[PDB]
Specification:
This is part of a larger assembly, with chains A (208 residues), B (125 residues), C (155 residues), D (121 residues) and E (50 residues).
Chain A (H helix, E strand, L loop, with lengths): L11 E3 L10 E3 L37 H15 L2 H7 L11 E3 L9 H10 L3 H10 L1 E2 L11 E2 L5 E4 L5 H5 L6 E4 L5 H4 L9 E4 H6 L1
Parallel strand pairs in A: 3-8, 6-7, 6-8
Antiparallel strand pairs in A: 1-2, 4-5
Chain B lengths: L10 H9 L3 H7 L1 E3 L2 H7 L3 E3 L5 E4 L8 E8 L4 E10 L5 E6 L4 E5 L4 H9 L5
Antiparallel strand pairs in B: 1-2, 3-4, 3-7, 4-5, 5-6
Chain E lengths: L5 H13 L5 H4 L23
Chain A binds five RNA strands through helix 1, helix 3, strand 4, helix 5 and helix 6.
Subcellular location (chain D): Cytoplasm; Nucleus, Nucleolus
Organism (chain D): Schizosaccharomyces pombe (strain 972 / ATCC 24843)
Family (chain D): Belongs to the universal ribosomal protein uL29 family.
Amino acid sequence: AVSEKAGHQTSAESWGTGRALARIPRVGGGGTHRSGQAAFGNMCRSGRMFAPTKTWRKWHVKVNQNEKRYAIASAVAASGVPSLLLARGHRIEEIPEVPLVVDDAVQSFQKTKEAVALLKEIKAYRDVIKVANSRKLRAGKGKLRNRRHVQRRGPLVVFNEDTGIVKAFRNIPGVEIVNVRRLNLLQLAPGGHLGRFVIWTKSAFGLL
Amino acid sequence: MKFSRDVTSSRRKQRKAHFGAPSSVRRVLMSAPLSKELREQYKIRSLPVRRDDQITVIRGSNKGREGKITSVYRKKFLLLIERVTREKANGASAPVGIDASKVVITKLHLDKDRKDLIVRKGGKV
Amino acid sequence: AIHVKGQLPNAHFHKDWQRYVKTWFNQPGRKLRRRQARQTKAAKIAPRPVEAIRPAVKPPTIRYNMKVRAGRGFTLEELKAAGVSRRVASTIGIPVDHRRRNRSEESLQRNVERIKVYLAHLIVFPRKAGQPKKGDATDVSGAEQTDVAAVLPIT
Amino acid sequence: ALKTFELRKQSQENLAEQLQELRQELASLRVQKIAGGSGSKLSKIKTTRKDIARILTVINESNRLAAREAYKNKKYIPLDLRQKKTRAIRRALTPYEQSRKTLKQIKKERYFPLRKYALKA
Amino acid sequence: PSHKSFRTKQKLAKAARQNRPIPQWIRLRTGNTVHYNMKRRHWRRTKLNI
RNA sequence: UUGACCUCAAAUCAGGUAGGACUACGCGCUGAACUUAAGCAUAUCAAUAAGCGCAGGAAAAGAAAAUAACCAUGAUUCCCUCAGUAACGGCGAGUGAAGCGGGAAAAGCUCAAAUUUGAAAUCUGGCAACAUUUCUUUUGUUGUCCGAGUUGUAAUUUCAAGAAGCUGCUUUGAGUGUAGACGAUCGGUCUAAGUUCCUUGGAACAGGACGUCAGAGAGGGUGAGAACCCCGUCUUUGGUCGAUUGGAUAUGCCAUAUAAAGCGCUUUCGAAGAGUCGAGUUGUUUGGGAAUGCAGCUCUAAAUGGGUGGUAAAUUUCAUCUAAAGCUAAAUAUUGGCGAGAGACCGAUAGCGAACAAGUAGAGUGAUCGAAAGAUGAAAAGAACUUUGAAAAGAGAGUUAAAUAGUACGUGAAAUUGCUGAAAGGGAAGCAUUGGAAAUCAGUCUUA
RNA sequence: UUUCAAUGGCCCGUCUUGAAACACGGACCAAGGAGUCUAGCAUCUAUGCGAGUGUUUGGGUGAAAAACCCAUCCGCGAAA
RNA sequence: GUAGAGAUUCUGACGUGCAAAUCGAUCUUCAAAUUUGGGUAUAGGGGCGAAAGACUAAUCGAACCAUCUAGUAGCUGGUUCC
RNA sequence: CAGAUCUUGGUGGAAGUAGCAAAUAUUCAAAUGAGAACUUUGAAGACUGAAGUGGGGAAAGGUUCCAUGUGAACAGCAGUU
RNA sequence: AAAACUUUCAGCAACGGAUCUCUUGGCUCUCGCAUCGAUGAAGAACGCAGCGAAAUGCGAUACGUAAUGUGAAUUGCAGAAUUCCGUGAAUCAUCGAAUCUUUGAACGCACAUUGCGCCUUUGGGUUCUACCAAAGGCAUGCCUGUUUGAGUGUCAUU
């Protein structure tokens, strides 16, 4: 929101009619450029805008919990359909199976080299390479506002217990790691589009 | 990605810190890598530059040039290297500044404080 | 003016309300602050329970008298029946409500049993380590910070 | 360049006469500056000025430490020798008189302090 | 006027010193945003009002 | 005449303290009008703005002269709910709480009224010792003299009781070292991997090969998009070597418990705040309506008395609380200040008035008012030299990737202007349709 | 594309019964510039559940103002 | 009648002026209720006034400054692409 | 966004136009200079005419004083002043 | 009915500073903290650098001294240097010792007057009963105490 007093900190009053000028308020006094210039208006320079933005706008919108659970269930079901995954953009043309379930030994990984080796074995590293090659600079004023780079989304690794899988996988570009108990729709259907490539650990799949 | 809440990921604040850094901070900002021989001998990846160090230009129009550091021009983030000059129109010679990260140190100016720095930073002298 | 279908408007917005608008953007920040203080208190006062034991009372109205809720503290008469001195109760964490009184033996027996369960499950560390005196645990090695709600809820 | 610790191991009279000599050198250097002086002399002006500051600092430390010793273990000491944290802190109650309790409260806390306790599962 | 007070003498003496052009060596410094004195004053145009 | 005491003065008396600023939030006082009522006077705006006084890191409020009418609840504060409700209103415009319930946080108490009377047991100050330290800066203890004090300082008691008695069990430092352990704390210090080749370029940080690191592929810098050149980032709520604190411990020492206290039953007594409650009236307030609070003035109690039980009054019962004295953390607020982090924000006529030497320059006697203004390039390499001119400059040259970047500097739009080329023009011009003329151009074919 | 010929063509915006008007505003150009936001209410539509419904006052949880989970109240509805 | 103080007439000059009140000529007064400097008091529903609603810093039938205030508007003007 | 006697900025036609006409008035030679109606010197001619266009101060200004130097800008022409 | 002039179009040069890109700035939300002053604050004045007018810093110890950390600059020029067998460069950071002019609540009285005083101690010189200088002081209300008083206030002694 703009400041509550931007455009009104000046003193200015309408000079009236009869002076061959618009009846808008003008700065009084003299000796400076600002003297005699209009004030207090959206159309005016250094004036206030029309309908200043306020912080008590509604930024958060409430959603029924049951509808949220409906959307999570739909997003999980879409992730199990191979055709939607290819549409969504994931390079899964040689993935051994969908849904992809991997052993519990992955939860105990400790190195990103082991995590990348796992991805290459299950042929899921094409999606990571897709993310790396898609990394770009943002278009527009976004990069002036701590939004420097953009890239595509890779696989989502779902685990049941943390033993090092988070730290092993968290540096691979595009890979998002999530606990099964707290699945997020912002990750399950990113951008509103269904069918994200999800790699489940065996314990997570059993707890589904 | 950073996970500390005391470190700034703001492009604005990082650029202000770089360009408002005092002399004692620009000393560490202007660091240069060590050559293969010094790196394998001192077990140090890089050290801050210092006057009278014997360095080699790695990048730029003066790639491959050799010389000693005559003066670390900290306030402009530039290193002035001997024999690395440019000829003005009137015939005078103007030293050309080279960034610290674009050179490599091939011989240090070993003082006791520099020796303590080496052994402190997990190195061997 | 008024020419549309619906209620007659009643918007109490004729004062300068925009000065006193209250937003809730610190709602998670307040929530996190309360927990950290709550966890700080639990670590500071451990091993004793974080929340003191409360009596079970009845709300004062035909609308709510069929329910049982938690009171402020145990009355003097209830403590005397349970055998706890008024001075000792506040030391070992039994709140004392001087204002309340027991008009019915039903409520008195309810809270007396409540205190007796608390006393039976209570471990009191000796003032000087190694010399138990009267009400005092001989073995305090197994002491742990549990929840009074887990031990004894309002039923 | 006068070294401050070497100053510290000298007498007050020696510091005073060195201060007078340093002032005389500073006066002569300023005479050169108005009459046209060289870069070396103009650079010596600042060093002489700092040396005079160091002499005056060392003298002051000795005078104030002597005052502190003289006023040590005395009920009233000079205001500049007292604490100066903030005006509010000085006015505040001391921890001794903040912890003062009546005989009633002492007996109550002596006999019924907050016991350390715990609950079984 | 000829009849002054010492406070006015002091105020005029400072204002006379502040009404001078920039040293040239200032402009040669790196990162210098000063090119001319923004605070010059002529005895006819703008008065001190002291 | 000396003295004593009371009262009142004086001192550059010994030692202290108050003012002023900030004021976003906090406690009061004082106090509008615009405005709404389609006019307007009550109302509303609004118990608001301005004015005034006084605080803190919060303040205020706070352990019931509180609700309720229940199977009763139990200091205060805040949140949700009650509830746009009961009620108040030219019953018009409009305004408008509280009990319960759910939660966040929880912590209780201190005096006055009592004969210590077998002992003013209390306290300030001087002086002299010792001692202690965020600290030679801080904070005290002991001794002793003067003084304050019986017109009352201690112990004792606070209504939840208690005090006097009575027997009979249980309980106890306002301590001071030491040692190590276990935590916390601001802070000095330590940190993985390409600058390997080819092409482009002024510069490789680009494209293409070949690799490496990853608990680090945040972000910034560096001559163009850099995980591997550099600072960093992750490891880290940690290693380290220096510090400050916390609660326990492990001990040593001083501790005169003859004492002090909790509990138990008493045929017992049981002190409880006054020009105050209350009443009338007048203003002002409230949702408070035959008065909700507050204030002025008049009248002014009481002792199972006095408050409150939301329609005046009289009488009678029933509950409830215990006023006119006091303290008290947490949950709560925070357009100020200090320090951090971000952002679906603004991107130099925007965002603060101020991205810059901005509350500046300038204006007014004054109170006040108050601008405009960012960008050469990677690097000044900011144009040596010759030549024309009195000079400013020009033309050569030179620098650069580039001067179509020369400080009157990125890009360089439109208005407007000069030159060149083309065409038109007899008191407007511009425009539409249709074609000629001149200029200009593409499809199409070429092939299958 | 320019220009000529023949034909037609008043200066727009505005309030107005009626404007080319001897009614108003407009010399030109660039950038700025006017139905927004919030507390409600009413129809209509979409979605989830459905005699129910509403997680978000709070608690748990999440290294992270998100997401996820949960108790007791309560609001509206189930009776006028 | 001059210095000084005024300001009648020309309804002269000028009237985007030398000038947000001036210039020329004529004219009134000129030893006092005269003209004036500095010091000093009176301040906005107030001052002050040989009185004209005059004057109170080019502002006077209620000055000026900042606020409440983005006062209000059945009235005027504008209100942006196909 | 085409309008709001819209806001700020830039720019036009009018236009090389109105105008630079109060206070009597200048002229010659030389020097200076790239450059002289305007600078300096000399000669002449006039004016203010002691209630001055003289010599001073008060209030107000503040360095405008003095010497030296001067590419512009300023001195509504010029400039060596 | 040619040129000029007027108008249109195009190229180029002007005028102007729009557009595009950027941004050590602003705005907004969140988090943490409690810290001004008679021991002289906030604010003001005037000064301080080898070469400074402003901004920033500082106070006659004046772009600063001590102390701690880092470890070789600063830079526009001059200038030094620190050897590089360190007590040490620096417009560095940090900061527990000091300095802190004239003011200002502002405190001896004043103040469009570097105006007018008083008290104590000390010092100075070709000059000593003079003159000058230095250091430390002198506000108001109030509180506890001290000392000195006042009173046809209450009384004893007599």
